[PDB]
Coordinates of C-alpha atoms and ligand atoms in Angstrom, one line a residue:
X1 CA -0.1 0.0 -0.1
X2 CA 1.3 3.5 -1.1
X3 CA 1.9 6.3 1.2
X4 CA 4.0 9.5 0.0
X5 CA 4.0 13.3 0.1
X6 CA 6.5 15.9 -1.5
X7 CA 7.3 19.3 0.4
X8 CA 7.1 22.4 -1.7
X9 CA 7.7 25.0 1.0
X10 CA 10.8 26.9 1.7
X11 CA 13.5 25.4 3.8
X12 CA 12.4 27.5 6.8
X13 CA 8.9 26.2 6.4
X14 CA 10.3 22.7 6.2
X15 CA 11.9 23.1 9.5
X16 CA 9.0 24.7 11.3
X17 CA 6.7 21.7 9.9
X18 CA 9.4 19.1 10.9
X19 CA 9.3 20.4 14.5
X20 CA 5.5 20.7 14.7
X21 CA 5.2 17.1 13.4
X22 CA 7.7 15.8 15.9
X23 CA 5.9 17.7 18.6
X24 CA 2.7 15.9 17.4
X25 CA 4.5 12.5 17.6
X26 CA 5.6 13.2 21.2
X27 CA 2.1 14.3 21.9
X28 CA 0.6 11.2 20.4
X29 CA 3.3 9.1 22.3
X30 CA 1.6 10.2 25.5
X31 CA -1.9 9.0 24.1
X32 CA -0.3 5.5 23.4
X33 CA 1.4 5.5 26.9
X34 CA -1.8 6.6 28.8
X35 CA -3.8 3.8 26.8
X36 CA -1.3 1.5 28.0
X37 CA -1.6 2.4 31.5
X38 CA -5.5 2.3 31.5
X39 CA -5.5 -1.6 30.7
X40 CA -3.1 -2.7 33.3
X41 CA -6.0 -3.0 35.7
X42 CA -9.8 -2.5 36.0
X43 CA -8.8 -0.1 38.5
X44 CA -6.6 1.9 36.0
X45 CA -9.5 1.6 33.6
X46 CA -11.6 3.7 35.9
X47 CA -9.0 6.0 37.3
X48 CA -10.5 9.5 36.2
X49 CA -7.3 11.4 36.8
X50 CA -5.5 9.0 34.4
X51 CA -8.3 9.4 31.9
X52 CA -8.0 13.2 32.4
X53 CA -4.3 13.0 31.4
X54 CA -5.2 10.7 28.5
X55 CA -7.5 13.3 27.3
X56 CA -4.8 16.1 27.6
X57 CA -2.6 14.2 25.2
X58 CA -5.5 13.8 22.8
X59 CA -5.9 17.6 22.9
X60 CA -2.3 18.4 22.5
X61 CA -2.0 16.1 19.4
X62 CA -4.9 17.9 18.0
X63 CA -3.5 21.1 18.6
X64 CA -0.2 20.2 17.0
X65 CA -2.0 18.5 14.1
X66 CA -4.0 21.8 13.6
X67 CA -0.8 23.7 12.9
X68 CA 0.7 21.3 10.1
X69 CA 0.7 23.3 6.8
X70 CA -0.6 26.6 8.1
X71 CA -0.4 28.2 4.8
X72 CA -2.1 25.1 3.0
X73 CA 0.6 25.3 0.3
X74 CA 3.6 23.4 1.8
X75 CA 2.9 19.8 0.5
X76 CA 1.8 18.2 -2.8
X77 CA 1.0 14.9 -4.4
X78 CA -0.3 13.6 -0.9
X79 CA -0.8 10.0 -1.4
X80 CA -2.6 7.9 1.3
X81 CA -3.1 4.4 0.3
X82 CA -2.6 5.0 -3.2
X83 CA -5.5 7.8 -3.2
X84 CA -4.2 11.3 -4.2
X85 CA -5.8 13.8 -1.8
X86 CA -4.2 17.1 -3.6
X87 CA -6.8 16.6 -6.4
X88 CA -9.9 15.8 -4.1
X89 CA -9.3 18.8 -1.6
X90 CA -9.0 21.2 -4.8
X91 CA -12.5 20.0 -5.8
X92 CA -14.2 20.9 -2.3
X93 CA -15.8 24.2 -2.1
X94 CA -13.9 25.2 0.9
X95 CA -10.6 23.7 -0.4
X96 CA -7.8 23.6 2.2
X97 CA -4.8 21.7 3.1
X98 CA -4.1 18.3 1.5
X99 CA -1.6 17.7 4.6
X100 CA -4.3 18.0 7.1
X101 CA -7.0 16.2 5.2
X102 CA -4.5 13.3 5.2
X103 CA -3.7 13.4 8.8
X104 CA -7.5 12.8 9.7
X105 CA -7.1 9.4 7.9
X106 CA -5.8 6.4 10.0
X107 CA -2.2 6.2 9.2
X108 CA -2.1 9.5 7.0
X109 CA 1.1 10.6 9.0
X110 CA 2.9 7.8 6.9
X111 CA 2.4 10.2 3.8
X112 CA 3.3 13.5 5.5
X113 CA 6.4 11.8 7.4
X114 CA 8.0 11.0 4.0
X115 CA 7.6 14.7 2.8
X116 CA 9.2 15.8 6.0
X117 CA 11.8 13.2 5.9
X118 CA 11.0 11.7 9.4
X119 CA 12.1 8.2 9.1
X120 CA 9.2 5.8 9.1
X121 CA 11.4 3.1 11.1
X122 CA 10.9 5.2 14.3
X123 CA 7.0 5.1 13.8
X124 CA 6.4 8.8 14.0
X125 CA 2.5 8.2 14.4
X126 CA 0.2 10.9 14.7
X127 CA -3.4 10.1 14.9
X128 CA -6.4 12.2 15.6
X129 CA -9.3 9.8 15.4
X130 CA -10.1 9.0 19.3
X131 CA -13.6 8.4 19.7
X132 CA -14.7 6.9 23.2
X133 CA -12.2 8.9 25.2
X134 CA -12.1 12.1 23.2
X135 CA -12.9 15.0 25.3
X136 CA -14.4 16.8 22.5
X137 CA -17.2 15.2 20.2
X138 CA -15.2 13.2 18.1
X139 CA -16.3 14.4 14.6
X140 CA -16.0 18.1 15.6
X141 CA -12.2 17.1 16.8
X142 CA -11.5 15.8 13.4
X143 CA -12.9 18.5 11.6
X144 CA -11.1 21.3 13.5
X145 CA -8.0 19.4 12.7
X146 CA -8.8 19.3 8.9
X147 CA -9.5 23.1 9.2
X148 CA -6.3 24.0 11.0
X149 CA -8.0 25.3 14.1
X150 CA -5.4 25.9 16.5
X151 CA -7.6 28.5 17.8
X152 CA -10.6 26.6 18.5
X153 CA -8.7 23.3 19.7
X154 CA -8.5 23.5 23.4
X155 CA -4.9 22.7 24.9
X156 CA -6.5 21.7 28.4
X157 CA -9.3 19.3 29.3
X158 CA -10.3 22.0 31.9
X159 CA -10.5 24.4 28.9
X160 CA -13.1 22.1 26.7
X161 CA -16.3 23.8 26.8
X162 CA -19.6 21.7 27.2
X163 CA -20.7 23.2 23.6
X164 CA -17.7 21.6 22.1
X165 CA -18.8 18.1 23.9
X166 CA -21.5 17.0 26.1
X167 CA -23.8 19.8 25.0
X168 CA -22.3 20.0 21.5
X169 CA -25.5 20.9 19.8
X170 CA -25.3 24.4 21.4
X171 CA -22.4 25.2 19.1
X172 CA -24.6 24.0 16.1
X173 CA -27.3 26.3 17.0
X174 CA -25.2 29.6 17.4
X175 CA -24.4 29.7 13.8
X176 CA -27.8 28.9 12.0
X177 CA -26.6 26.2 9.6
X178 CA -29.0 24.2 7.4
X179 CA -29.4 20.8 8.6
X180 CA -30.6 18.2 6.1
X181 CA -32.9 15.2 7.0
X182 CA -30.0 12.6 7.2
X183 CA -28.2 14.9 9.7
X184 CA -31.2 15.5 12.0
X185 CA -31.5 11.8 12.1
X186 CA -27.7 11.5 13.3
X187 CA -28.0 14.3 15.7
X188 CA -30.8 12.4 17.4
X189 CA -28.3 9.7 18.2
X190 CA -25.6 12.1 19.1
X191 CA -28.0 13.8 21.5
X192 CA -28.4 10.5 23.5
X193 CA -24.5 10.2 23.3
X194 CA -22.1 12.5 21.4
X195 CA -19.2 9.7 21.5
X196 CA -21.5 7.0 19.8
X197 CA -18.9 5.6 17.3
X198 CA -19.7 6.1 13.6
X199 CA -20.5 2.4 12.5
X200 CA -22.9 2.3 15.3
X201 CA -24.5 5.8 14.0
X202 CA -24.6 4.1 10.6
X203 CA -25.7 0.8 11.9
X204 CA -29.0 2.3 13.3
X205 CA -29.8 4.7 10.7
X206 CA -29.2 1.9 8.2
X207 CA -26.5 3.6 6.3
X208 CA -22.7 3.1 5.6
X209 CA -20.2 4.9 7.6
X210 CA -19.4 7.0 4.5
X211 CA -23.0 8.1 4.5
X212 CA -23.0 8.9 8.0
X213 CA -19.9 10.9 7.7
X214 CA -20.2 12.8 4.2
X215 CA -17.3 14.9 2.7
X216 CA -15.2 17.0 4.9
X217 CA -16.8 20.1 3.4
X218 CA -20.1 22.3 4.0
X219 CA -21.7 21.2 0.7
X220 CA -22.1 17.5 1.5
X221 CA -24.4 15.6 4.1
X222 CA -23.2 13.9 7.2
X223 CA -21.6 14.8 10.5
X224 CA -18.4 16.0 9.2
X225 CA -20.2 18.2 6.5
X226 CA -22.2 19.4 9.4
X227 CA -19.4 20.3 11.6
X228 CA -17.5 21.8 8.5
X229 CA -20.8 23.9 7.8
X230 CA -20.6 25.2 11.4
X231 CA -16.8 25.5 11.8
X232 CA -16.0 27.5 8.6
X233 CA -18.5 30.1 9.8
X234 CA -16.4 30.7 13.1
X235 CA -14.2 33.6 13.0
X236 CA -10.5 32.7 13.2
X237 CA -9.6 33.8 16.6
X238 CA -5.8 34.6 15.8
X239 CA -5.4 35.9 19.4
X240 CA -6.3 32.6 21.0
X241 CA -4.2 30.6 18.4
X242 CA -1.1 32.6 19.9
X243 CA -1.9 31.6 23.4
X244 CA -2.3 28.1 22.4
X245 CA 1.0 27.9 20.4
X246 CA 2.9 29.5 23.3
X247 CA 1.5 27.3 26.1
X248 CA 1.4 24.0 24.4
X249 CA 5.1 22.8 24.6
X250 CA 5.8 23.5 28.2
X251 CA 2.1 22.0 28.8
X252 CA 3.6 18.8 27.1
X253 CA 6.6 18.8 29.4
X254 CA 4.1 19.2 32.3
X255 CA 2.0 16.2 30.8
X256 CA 4.9 13.9 30.8
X257 CA 5.7 15.0 34.2
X258 CA 2.2 14.1 35.4
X259 CA 2.5 10.7 33.6
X260 CA 5.5 9.5 35.7
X261 CA 3.7 10.5 39.0
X262 CA 0.4 8.7 38.0
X263 CA 2.2 5.5 36.6
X264 CA 3.5 4.8 40.0
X265 CA 0.0 3.7 41.1
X266 CA 0.1 0.8 38.7
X267 CA 3.6 0.1 37.9
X268 CA 6.9 -0.7 39.9
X269 CA 8.8 1.6 37.8
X270 CA 7.7 5.1 36.5
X271 CA 6.5 5.5 32.8
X272 CA 9.1 8.2 31.4
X273 CA 9.6 9.6 28.0
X274 CA 12.7 7.1 27.6
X275 CA 10.2 4.2 28.4
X276 CA 7.6 5.3 25.8
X277 CA 10.3 5.9 23.2
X278 CA 11.5 2.4 23.7
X279 CA 8.2 0.6 23.8
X280 CA 6.1 2.8 21.5
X281 CA 6.6 0.3 18.5
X282 CA 6.0 -2.7 20.8
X283 CA 2.9 -1.2 22.3
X284 CA 1.4 -0.5 18.9
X285 CA 2.3 -3.8 17.3
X286 CA 0.2 -5.3 20.3
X287 CA -2.7 -3.2 19.8
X288 CA -2.8 -3.8 16.1
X289 CA -2.9 -7.5 16.9
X290 CA -5.9 -7.5 19.3
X291 CA -7.5 -5.3 16.5
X292 CA -6.9 -7.7 13.8
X293 CA -8.7 -10.4 16.0
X294 CA -11.6 -8.3 17.0
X295 CA -12.0 -7.0 13.4
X296 CA -11.4 -10.4 11.5
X297 CA -14.0 -11.6 13.9
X298 CA -16.5 -9.2 12.6
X299 CA -15.6 -9.7 9.1
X300 CA -17.1 -13.0 9.5
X301 CA -20.1 -12.4 12.0
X302 CA -21.5 -9.3 10.2
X303 CA -20.3 -9.7 6.6
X304 CA -19.2 -13.3 6.1
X305 CA -15.8 -13.6 4.8
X306 CA -14.1 -16.8 4.7
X307 CA -12.0 -17.2 7.9
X308 CA -8.4 -17.0 6.3
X309 CA -9.4 -14.2 3.9
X310 CA -11.0 -12.0 6.8
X311 CA -7.6 -12.1 8.7
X312 CA -5.7 -11.1 5.5
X313 CA -7.5 -7.8 5.3
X314 CA -7.4 -7.4 8.9
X315 CA -3.7 -7.3 8.8
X316 CA -3.4 -5.3 5.7
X317 CA -5.4 -2.6 6.8
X318 CA -4.4 -2.0 10.5
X319 CA -7.6 -3.6 11.9
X320 CA -10.2 -0.9 10.6
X321 CA -13.5 -1.8 9.0
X322 CA -13.7 2.1 8.0
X323 CA -10.3 1.8 6.0
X324 CA -11.1 -1.5 4.5
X325 CA -14.7 -0.3 3.6
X326 CA -13.4 2.9 1.7
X327 CA -10.7 0.9 -0.3
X328 CA -11.2 0.0 -3.8
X329 CA -11.5 -3.7 -4.9
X330 CA -8.2 -3.5 -7.1
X331 CA -6.4 -2.6 -3.9
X332 CA -8.2 -5.0 -1.6
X333 CA -7.3 -7.9 -4.1
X334 CA -3.7 -6.6 -4.4
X335 CA -3.1 -7.7 -0.7
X336 CA -5.5 -10.4 -0.4
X337 CA -5.9 -12.2 -3.9
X338 CA -8.1 -14.9 -2.4
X339 CA -11.1 -12.5 -1.8
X340 CA -14.3 -12.4 -3.7
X341 CA -16.4 -9.6 -5.3
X342 CA -19.4 -10.4 -3.3
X343 CA -17.1 -10.2 -0.2
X344 CA -15.6 -6.8 -1.2
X345 CA -19.3 -5.5 -1.8
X346 CA -20.2 -6.8 1.8
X347 CA -17.6 -4.7 3.5
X348 CA -17.4 -1.8 0.9
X349 CA -20.8 -0.4 0.7
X350 CA -20.0 2.2 -1.7
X351 CA -18.5 -0.2 -4.2
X352 CA -21.6 -2.5 -3.6
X353 CA -24.0 0.7 -4.5
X354 CA -21.9 1.5 -7.6
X355 CA -22.2 -2.3 -9.0
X356 CA -25.5 -3.3 -8.0
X357 CA -27.6 0.0 -8.1
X358 CA -25.8 1.9 -11.0
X359 CA -24.5 -1.2 -12.9
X360 CA -20.8 -0.1 -12.8
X361 CA -17.7 -2.2 -13.5
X362 CA -15.3 -2.8 -10.8
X363 CA -12.6 -1.0 -12.6
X364 CA -15.0 2.0 -12.8
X365 CA -16.3 1.7 -9.3
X366 CA -12.7 1.7 -8.2
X367 CA -12.2 4.7 -10.3
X368 CA -14.9 6.8 -8.7
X369 CA -14.0 5.3 -5.1
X370 CA -10.3 6.6 -5.8
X371 CA -11.3 10.0 -6.9
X372 CA -14.2 10.6 -4.6
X373 CA -14.1 7.8 -2.0
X374 CA -18.1 7.6 -1.7
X375 CA -21.3 8.8 -3.1
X376 CA -21.2 11.8 -0.7
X377 CA -18.0 12.5 -2.4
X378 CA -19.3 12.6 -5.7
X379 CA -22.3 14.8 -4.7
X380 CA -19.8 17.3 -2.8
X381 CA -18.1 17.6 -6.3
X382 CA -19.3 20.3 -8.9
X383 CA -20.9 18.9 -11.8
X384 CA -18.8 20.9 -14.2
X385 CA -15.5 19.6 -12.4
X386 CA -16.7 16.0 -13.2
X387 CA -17.1 17.2 -16.8
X388 CA -13.7 18.7 -16.9
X389 CA -12.1 15.4 -15.5
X390 CA -14.0 13.4 -18.4
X391 CA -12.7 16.0 -21.0
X392 CA -9.2 16.3 -19.9
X393 CA -9.0 12.4 -19.8
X394 CA -8.7 11.8 -16.2
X395 CA -11.9 10.0 -15.8
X396 CA -13.3 7.2 -18.0
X397 CA -16.6 7.4 -19.6
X398 CA -18.5 4.8 -17.5
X399 CA -17.4 6.5 -14.4
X400 CA -18.0 9.9 -15.5
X401 CA -21.5 9.1 -16.7
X402 CA -22.4 7.2 -13.3
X403 CA -21.1 10.3 -11.6
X404 CA -23.6 12.5 -13.7
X405 CA -26.5 10.2 -13.3
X406 CA -26.0 10.2 -9.3
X407 CA -25.8 14.1 -9.2
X408 CA -28.8 14.3 -11.4
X409 CA -30.8 11.8 -9.6
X410 CA -30.6 13.7 -6.3
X411 CA -32.8 16.5 -8.2
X412 CA -34.8 14.7 -10.5
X413 CA -36.1 12.5 -7.6
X414 CA -38.2 15.6 -6.4
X415 CA -41.3 15.7 -8.3
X416 CA -41.8 18.3 -11.0
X417 CA -38.0 18.4 -11.6
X418 CA -36.9 17.1 -15.0
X419 CA -33.5 16.3 -16.2
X420 CA -32.5 19.6 -18.0
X421 CA -33.9 21.6 -15.1
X422 CA -31.8 19.6 -13.0
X423 CA -28.8 19.6 -14.9
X424 CA -29.4 23.6 -15.2
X425 CA -29.4 23.9 -11.4
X426 CA -26.1 22.1 -11.1
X427 CA -24.5 24.6 -13.4
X428 CA -25.9 27.7 -11.5
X429 CA -25.0 26.5 -8.0
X430 CA -22.3 23.7 -8.5
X431 CA -23.5 20.4 -7.1
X432 CA -26.7 18.8 -5.8
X433 CA -25.7 19.3 -2.2
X434 CA -25.4 23.2 -2.6
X435 CA -28.8 23.4 -4.4
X436 CA -30.6 21.5 -1.5
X437 CA -28.9 23.9 0.9
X438 CA -30.0 27.1 -1.1
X439 CA -33.9 25.3 -0.7
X440 CA -33.5 24.7 3.0
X441 CA -32.3 28.4 3.4
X442 CA -35.4 29.3 1.6
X443 CA -33.4 31.2 -1.2
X444 CA -36.7 31.1 -3.4
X445 CA -35.7 34.1 -5.8
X446 CA -32.5 32.8 -6.3
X447 CA -33.5 29.4 -7.4
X448 CA -36.4 30.5 -9.4
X449 CA -34.3 32.7 -11.7
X450 CA -33.1 29.5 -13.4
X451 CA -35.0 28.1 -16.4
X452 CA -37.5 25.3 -15.7
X453 CA -37.9 26.2 -12.0
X454 CA -41.6 26.8 -11.5
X455 CA -44.0 26.6 -8.7
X456 CA -44.3 23.0 -9.0
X457 CA -40.3 22.6 -8.5
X458 CA -40.4 25.4 -5.8
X459 CA -43.2 23.3 -4.1
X460 CA -41.3 20.1 -3.9
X461 CA -37.8 21.7 -3.2
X462 CA -38.2 24.3 -0.5
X463 CA -39.5 23.2 2.8
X464 CA -42.7 25.0 3.8
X465 CA -43.2 27.1 0.5
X466 CA -46.0 24.5 -0.4
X467 CA -47.7 25.4 2.6
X468 CA -47.5 29.2 2.6
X469 CA -48.0 29.6 -1.1
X470 CA -51.2 27.7 -1.0
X471 CA -52.8 30.4 1.1
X472 CA -54.6 33.0 -1.4
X473 CA -52.9 36.5 -1.5
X474 CA -49.3 35.3 -0.1
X475 CA -47.1 36.1 -3.0
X476 CA -43.6 34.6 -3.6
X477 CA -41.6 37.6 -2.4
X478 CA -43.7 37.2 0.7
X479 CA -43.2 33.4 1.2
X480 CA -39.6 34.2 1.2
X481 CA -39.6 37.0 3.6
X482 CA -41.7 35.1 6.2
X483 CA -39.8 31.6 6.0
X484 CA -36.4 33.7 6.1
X485 CA -37.2 35.8 9.0
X486 CA -38.7 33.0 11.3
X487 CA -37.1 29.8 10.2
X488 CA -39.4 27.7 8.2
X489 CA -43.2 27.4 8.0
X490 CA -43.8 25.7 11.3
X491 CA -42.0 28.5 13.2
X492 CA -44.0 31.1 11.0
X493 CA -47.2 29.4 12.1
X494 CA -45.9 29.8 15.6
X495 CA -45.5 33.5 15.2
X496 CA -47.3 36.0 17.0
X497 CA -50.6 37.5 15.5
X498 CA -49.4 41.1 16.1
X499 CA -46.1 40.5 14.4
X500 CA -47.6 38.6 11.4
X501 CA -49.8 41.9 10.8
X502 CA -46.5 44.0 10.8
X503 CA -45.2 41.4 8.1
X504 CA -48.3 42.3 6.2
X505 CA -50.7 39.3 6.5
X506 CA -54.5 40.1 6.1
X507 CA -56.4 38.7 9.0
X508 CA -58.0 36.1 6.8
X509 CA -54.3 34.7 5.8
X510 CA -53.4 34.8 9.5
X511 CA -56.7 33.0 10.4
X512 CA -56.1 30.1 7.8
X513 CA -52.5 29.7 8.8
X514 CA -53.2 29.0 12.4
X515 CA -56.5 27.5 11.6
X516 CA -58.5 28.9 14.5
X517 CA -61.6 30.0 12.6
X518 CA -63.8 28.0 15.1
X519 CA -62.0 29.6 18.0
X520 CA -62.7 33.1 16.6
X521 CA -66.4 32.2 16.4
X522 CA -66.1 31.7 20.0
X523 CA -64.3 34.7 20.7
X524 CA -64.2 38.3 19.3
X525 CA -60.6 38.8 17.5
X526 CA -57.8 36.7 16.4
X527 CA -55.3 37.4 19.2
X528 CA -57.5 35.9 22.0
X529 CA -58.3 33.0 19.6
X530 CA -54.6 32.3 19.5
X531 CA -54.3 32.7 23.3
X532 CA -56.7 30.2 23.4
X533 CA -55.4 27.9 20.8
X534 CA -51.9 27.8 22.8
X535 CA -53.2 26.6 26.2
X536 CA -56.0 24.5 25.2
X537 CA -55.8 22.3 21.9
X538 CA -59.0 23.2 20.3
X539 CA -62.6 24.8 20.6
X540 CA -63.6 21.3 21.3
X541 CA -61.5 21.8 24.6
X542 CA -62.5 25.1 25.5
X543 CA -66.1 24.2 25.8
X544 CA -65.3 21.4 28.2
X545 CA -63.5 23.7 30.6
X546 CA -65.2 24.1 34.2
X547 CA -67.7 26.9 34.5
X548 CA -65.5 28.8 37.0
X549 CA -62.4 28.6 34.5
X550 CA -64.4 29.8 31.7
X551 CA -65.9 32.7 33.7
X552 CA -62.4 33.3 35.2
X553 CA -60.2 35.3 32.7
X554 CA -62.9 35.1 30.2
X555 CA -66.3 36.6 29.5
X556 CA -70.1 36.5 30.1
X557 CA -72.2 33.7 31.7
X558 CA -74.6 34.1 28.9
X559 CA -71.7 33.5 26.6
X560 CA -70.8 30.3 28.9
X561 CA -74.2 29.2 28.4
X562 CA -74.0 29.6 24.7
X563 CA -70.6 28.1 24.5
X564 CA -71.8 24.8 26.4
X565 CA -75.3 24.8 24.5
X566 CA -77.2 24.7 27.8
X567 CA -80.8 24.6 26.9
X568 CA -83.2 27.7 28.0
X569 CA -85.1 25.6 30.4
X570 CA -82.2 24.1 32.3
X571 CA -80.6 27.6 32.3
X572 CA -83.8 29.3 33.7
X573 CA -83.9 27.3 36.9
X574 CA -80.5 26.4 38.1
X575 CA -77.3 28.3 38.5
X576 CA -74.5 27.8 35.7
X577 CA -72.5 25.6 37.9
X578 CA -75.1 23.0 38.3
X579 CA -77.0 23.5 34.9
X580 CA -73.8 22.8 32.8
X581 CA -72.8 19.9 35.1
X582 CA -76.1 18.1 34.6
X583 CA -75.9 18.5 30.8
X584 CA -72.5 17.3 30.5
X585 CA -73.5 14.3 32.7
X586 CA -76.6 13.4 30.6
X587 CA -76.5 15.3 27.4
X588 CA -80.2 15.6 26.4
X589 CA -82.4 17.0 29.1
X590 CA -84.9 14.2 28.6
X591 CA -82.3 12.0 30.3
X592 CA -82.0 14.8 32.8
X593 CA -85.4 13.4 34.0
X594 CA -83.5 10.0 35.0
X595 CA -82.6 11.3 38.5
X596 CA -85.5 11.6 41.0
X597 CA -88.2 14.2 41.1
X598 CA -86.7 16.5 43.9
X599 CA -83.2 15.2 43.6
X600 CA -83.7 18.3 41.6
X601 CA -83.6 20.3 45.1
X602 CA -82.0 23.3 43.4
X603 CA -84.0 26.3 43.0
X604 CA -87.9 26.6 42.0
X605 CA -90.3 23.7 41.3
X606 CA -89.4 23.8 37.9
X607 CA -92.0 21.2 36.6
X608 CA -91.1 21.2 32.8
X609 CA -88.0 19.2 33.6
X610 CA -89.6 16.2 34.7
Ligands
LIG1 ZN1 -7.3 28.2 25.4

């Protein structure tokens, strides 16, 4: 399997990167060492002070990783397992560093270490994919690294705010990012537990990990895309980036100092920088080993690969189904030539879809995997770039054509949208994911200004346009203004009546929207109808309310008589309290003559009742 990368910065930059990387390695050495201590005993497993130190190393590795390729120009032709990230990162809407994009992949450091000449024999590992023990929401951690966010990466487990961890969703709400339906589904699990592993998120949603994750860019769909959407909209805090670079090297010393102290809880001899420098390779070789077991065991239980092949893959791909699952068939067979295609299609869902649901050849599917990794990766790419690749001879016809048909199918599925209107939209706005996002942001004029995009298109594309526009008198401009101001139909429906008037809605329009025509019979004006619609569900409910309650913060006793349909004869004798109660209980009045003659002891000798 091929890893490689070439440096293109100046000689100063070369040394800057070497020092950062080597400090990342030193930081990651602490992560390995602390993981080692944690499984010396179940007592060590549950040492929270040890866990806090483990986490501190994770943080510092992140910070150092964020600093790789600060100017986003120092590396080129970054190959990880044969796939060239230079070209892919360039096609993303937010571009960025091929180096850091590489580092977010397991064993991506391999590629970067070659460009910085750090000899692979010393295993200069930097990994930034911790899940269960990560002090930040794991996907966030990874996206911060890809976007080089030295500033946002905390350098201390104390410094980690809830909004980047246990209450991560707060951070999402602060930046008014559009969330699609896949993502809202993913959040529902992350809300239960932000440290749910991705293959679990995928298994419950009935998706591949690639689908759960998406591309690491705003214009995709998935937890990575979501976090990118948020993170890019956070101002770079150049100040705090300075604090973090200034402080972290000595914090690392201090972490290593704390590692000695703690290690004496579980070991005869301290765990020192020299010790980890010596055992690093051995520690890593052993973890790889029990991950080959666990993983090769899963390749049989879940996917059903013949035992001897399942171990081959397990070894070849560092014990990672994520890794295996995103590897092309040609590369998979290169290292395990015993493997069969139905077996490859079992673990690599992208390969499976491309073959079985788009009739692609394995070579052609490999081509698309290599360039884009997943379907999400195809949909993150501008249509016209895919055309360019086809024309420039860097993409075969069958791959190219499948790519087009995937992009078009995301829009033609939406009733009203034909192929040339879909095709046009992709030209106007780049890719299908970016088209959808404009619809969720309610950019109705922007979309409409494309040929073939009519009311029927707008209906099926823009959430809540269907609802507002089907009310007479509400024009397109208004529908956009309303949707944008309040955040979608449901939120517009929830708006106050006073402020909807200010927005220029006729009272008829407001009445239909909240569907309180029946309540406005019962009560004079719109506003009180709405007040009554909030607390109580319907008119139906308001009538049933106790006589005291209606009377209280309400209006007349005659009005309460009319509201509950209390007959003249029953109203003329008893007081309301007991009249509306007898009616509630028996319904007719003929029936009211079920209870005995002068059990009707209340008021006059009203004989017409018996
Ligand atoms: Zn800080």
